[PDB]
Each structure stands twice: as C-alpha cells, then as structure tokens.
Amino acid sequence: APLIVIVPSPGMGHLIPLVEFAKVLVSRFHFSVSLLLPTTAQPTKAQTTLLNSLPSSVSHNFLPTVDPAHLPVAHEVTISLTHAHSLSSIRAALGSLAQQAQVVALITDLFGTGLYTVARDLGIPPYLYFTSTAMCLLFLFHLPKLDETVSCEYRDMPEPLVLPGCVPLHGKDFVDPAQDRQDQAYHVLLDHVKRYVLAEGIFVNTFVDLEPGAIKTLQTEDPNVPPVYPVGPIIQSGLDDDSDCLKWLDRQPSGSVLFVSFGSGGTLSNEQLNELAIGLEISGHRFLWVVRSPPFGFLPTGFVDRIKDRGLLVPSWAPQIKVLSHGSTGGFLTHCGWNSTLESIVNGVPLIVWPLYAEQRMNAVMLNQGLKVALRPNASQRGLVEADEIARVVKELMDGDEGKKARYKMRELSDSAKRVTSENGESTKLLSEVASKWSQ
Numbered sequence: 090a091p092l093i094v095i096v097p098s099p100g101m102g103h104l105i106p107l108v109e110f111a112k113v114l115v116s117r118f119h120f121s122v123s124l125l126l127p128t129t130a131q132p133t134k135a136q137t138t139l140l141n142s143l144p145s146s147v148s149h150n151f152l153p154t155v156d157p158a159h160l161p162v163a164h165e166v167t168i169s170l171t172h173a174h175s176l177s178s179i180r181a182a183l184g185s186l187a188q189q190a191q192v193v194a195l196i197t198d199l200f201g202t203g204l205y206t207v208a209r210d211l212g213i214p215p216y217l218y219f220t221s222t223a224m225c226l227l228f229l230f231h232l233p234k235l236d237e238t239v240s241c242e243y244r245d246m247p248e249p250l251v252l253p254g255c256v257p258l259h260g261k262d263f264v265d266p267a268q269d270r271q272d273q274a275y276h277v278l279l280d281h282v283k284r285y286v287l288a289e290g291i292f293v294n295t296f297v298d299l300e301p302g303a304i305k306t307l308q309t310e311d312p313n314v315p316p317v318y319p320v321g322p323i324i325q326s327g328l329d330d331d332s333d334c335l336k337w338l339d340r341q342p343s344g345s346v347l348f349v350s351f352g353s354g355g356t357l358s359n360e361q362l363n364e365l366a367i368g369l370e371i372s373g374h375r376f377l378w379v380v381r382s383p384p385f386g387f388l389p390t391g392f393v394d395r396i397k398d399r400g401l402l403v404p405s406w407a408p409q410i411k412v413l414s415h416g417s418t419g420g421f422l423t424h425c426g427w428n429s430t431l432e433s434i435v436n437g438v439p440l441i442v443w444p445l446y447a448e449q450r451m452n453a454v455m456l457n458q459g460l461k462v463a464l465r466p467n468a469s470q471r472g473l474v475e476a477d478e479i480a481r482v483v484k485e486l487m488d489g490d491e492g493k494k495a496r497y498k499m500r501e502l503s504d505s506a507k508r509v510t511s512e513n514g515e516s517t518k519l520l521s522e523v524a525s526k527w528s529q
C-alpha cells in the first residue's frame with residue numbers, strides 16, 4: 090500500500106483538519122498515512138488521545154522537540170520557526186520512510202512550505218492542504234503585489250480591496266498577521282506565500298457552489314499559481330465521548346435554539362461574557378451556550394436561575410456536530426473559524442458572526458456581505474458588544490425576516506454541500522482524480 094506523509098504545523102487547529110484529511114484518504118483509497126509532528130513541547134494528553142484513536146492505517150511519530158533556546162510573538166512566528174528548526178528531523182524521517190516504503194506524496198498546511206524543495210529533490214510531489222476559504226488563499230496569492238502597491242498600514246487604506254469574484258474587503262478585516270507590517274509575523278507570512286508556487290497542487294476545504302468567484306480566479310487569472318482542487322467540505326463525523334446537551338435539545342421546539350460557542354482559542358473578557366449573558370436573557374430566545382472561564386460563579390447575579398426555563402449553560406466543551414445537526418438548533422453564534430462554519434453550512438444553520446483572530450474577520454465579511462447567511466452585531470467604539478445589540482441580532486436571526494432570508498440561503502448551501510460530497514459529487518470525483526495519479 091503506497092504511503093502519504095502528512096506534516097501538520099503544531100497546534101490543534103492545524104492538526105485536526107489534516108488528521109480528518111488523513112482519515113478521508115485511508116477510508117476512500119488504498120493508502121497508508123504517516124503523520125510526522127514537529128513539537129515545541131512533549132506530547133499533550135489532547136494530542137495523544139486524538140492520535141492513538143486513529144485507524145491502524147495512520148501511523149504517527151512525534152519528532153524530537155525543538156530546543157526552546159533556538160527561538161529568538163504571533164503563532165505564525167512560533168509555527169514557522171518550529172518547521173525551520175525541525176527540517177533536519179523531517180528530512181531524516183522522510184529519508185528512512187522513502188527507503189522502507191513507496192512515499193507517493195507529502196502534504197503540509199500553509200506553514201509547511203519549507204519542505205517543498207526538499208520533497209522535490211527526493212522525488213516526492215508536495216501538496217498544500219488549505220484549511221480556510223478560496224477567498225483567503227486568493228488574498229494570500231495577492232498579498233505580495235498588495236505589499237508593493239499599498240505603503241500605509243492596511244487599516245488606513247480607506248478604499249476596500251476588491252479581488253476578482255469576491256466581496257469587497259476593508260483593510261481592518263485583512264488576516265491578523267497583516268495588521269502590523271513591522272511585526273515578524275507579516276514578513277514570515279510573505280515568505281510562506283511566495284513558496285505556494287512550489288506545490289504540485291493546493292487542496293482547499295471548500296466547494297465551487299460556495300466560492301465560485303474566488304475558485305474561477307485561482308484557477309485562471311495566473312499560470313504561475315499551481316492547480317487548485319476544491320475537495321470540501323471535510324468535517325469530523327462527531328461520534329464520540331459526551332453531556333446533558335442532546336437530552337436538553339430533545340425538549341425544545343424545532344429551530345428555536347441559538348447555539349453559542351467560540352473556539353478553545355477564542356477568549357472573551359468577564360465583561361464581554363456578562364454582556365452576552367444579559368443579552369441572551371433579554372432576547373427571550375432559547376440557547377445552548379458553551380461558557381469558557383474568562384463553574385459559572387462569575388456570571389451575572391440571578392442569571393443562571395432566571396434562564397433555566399429556556400437556556401442551558403455547558404462548561405468548556407459540547408458535541409458541536411451533534412448540536413448543529415439537531416432539529417432544535419436554528420442558529421449559531423460563532424467566531425467564524427472555517428471548520429465551525431463548514432459544520433454549520435452542511436447542517437443548514439444560519440449564523441451570527443463574531444470574529445476574534447486569524448482570518449475570521451474576512452470569513453465574517455464573506456458570510457455576512459457575500460453569501461448573506463450571517464448577521465453581525467455592532468461593537469461600541471471601545472470594542473465591547475452591548476447586551477442590547479446582542480438581543481437585537483439574536484431576535485433578528487431567530488424570529489426576524491433577515492433570519493428567514495439567511496436560513497433559506499444557508500439551507501441552499503446545505504443541499505449543494507450534500508450534492509458535491511455524494512458518490513458522484515464534484516468534490517468526491519476531483520479528490521479521487523488527483524489520488525489515482527498517486528496509486529500508480
């Protein structure tokens with residue numbers, strides 16, 4: 090059986106998507122996968138659980154920890170430096186896999202581009218698995234040109250960027266690392282993007298129906314740009330441990346529940362949580378809120394008791410796919426990470442977008458202004474979303490007209506998603522078409 094080597098960047102939001110791509114390759118095709126995991130610290134309980142829970146057809150190998158004195162900041166800088174100072178280790182592991190097995194392809198995420206030259210020299214075709222939107226990839230291919238054209242900090246450009254096929258995008262909504270051009274994060278992001286050209290191919294976790302403008306542009310505007318294969322949506326099955334959630338949801342009316350969840354990475358102040366609490370309570374709507382500390386002793390006086398009729402508070406974690414696929418669940422208040430968004434798209438759940446970090450502000454603009462499947466609260470000058478504004482936008486989504494229009498559009502995308510990932514879907518076919526080249 091041919092071997093595909095996957096080198097995730099350190100961090101769960103790089104690892105999980107690539108693990109799920111791995112599970113698709115071994116489920117649909119006759120391949121084995123070896124994960125080589127660069128690390129800044131010895132394996133976590135979280136990592137070991139996830140990795141030991143994989144099919145036997147997916148081997149894993151934590152690489153020597155990078156001596157933390159070899160570090161001089163943003164995740165972009167941490168991740169990039171982990172890859173650089175793990176290059177010897179990966180070469181060594183690849184060299185040995187290559188002699189003891191047929192390695193047919195290497196797959197990295199957007200920060201693993203250092204490996205591309207190295208993989209070519211050893212006659213292994215390198216591929217990028219892009220875990221965000223076609224719009225986001227297109228923005229990144231354009232960022233070098235944009236760096237030469239625009240000399241101000243991008244939030245001071247009053248004119249929006251209008252990429253072919255895309256919604257207008259104001260500079261304040263550009264990716265996090267591009268919001269300080271003096272930080273190392275910006276220079277590292279540029280260095281990686283300039284190497285995207287070296288990939289045999291770029292997988293994108295999206296589909297034609299969802300981003301036709303950006304996909305047309307990526308596949309036609311430039312011959313410099315590698316082949317681009319939309320093969321999404323790929324999301325976890327969500328069938329595992331935990332939780333009173335599903336019991337609670339079985340007692341609620343159809344489409345009546347707002348699911349409220351930010352990532353593990355999404356951190357709200359005690360102040361913003363308490364505004365969100367009062368805001369949910371006065372909306373009059375039912376809600377399931379995954380509450381992470383800034384167990385519920387920090388929440389407003391009386392609130393936990395006042396909302397027992399109509400809301401459920403979960404500490405730490407909830408079965409997201411099970412919540413979103415429940416018939417009770419009518420809306421999702423999310424940070425717009427792309428895996429959370431894709432889960433919500435394939436279950437037809439319309440959104441309230443509250444972007445926090447990474448490329449979320451761009452995802453928010455795309456979902457609100459482009460696809461019109463999301464609403465969006467207005468923060469006051471100081472950055473805080475007020476209770477009154479939360480209540481307004483919750484009611485607008487759960488009982489209002491803009492909600493109906495968004496839900497209708499989100500169901501249309503839901504049916505596209507089911508179609509493209511079926512036995513003869515565009516996404517299923519195109520992955521099978523690229524993977525077949527590897528089998529021989």
Ligand SMILES: O=c1ccn([C@@H]2O[C@H](COP(=O)(O)OP(=O)(O)O[C@H]3O[C@H](CO)[C@@H](O)[C@H](O)[C@H]3F)[C@@H](O)[C@H]2O)c(=O)[nH]1
Pocket residue numbers: 101102103105106220221325350351352353354379405406407408409410425426427428429430432446447448449
């Ligand atoms: O209580 C919970 C909370 C989460 N989950 C699950 O964890 C996953 C979270 O995915 P999400 O895209 O929201 O976060 P993350 O992967 O960190 O996003 C980054 O990585 C993304 C891909 O690179 C990028 O687009 C984004 O901007 C980044 F932030 C998703 O599979 C949820 O179902 C859950 O089951 N229960």
Ligand SMILES: COc1cc(/C=C/c2ccc(O)cc2)cc(OC)c1
Pocket residue numbers: 100101102103164199219220221225264265266278354447448
């Ligand atoms: C700077 O633009 C991006 C950042 C990121 C970074 C995501 C991330 C995920 C998990 C973490 O723990 C830290 C950062 C992802 C992107 O699309 C795949 C684009």
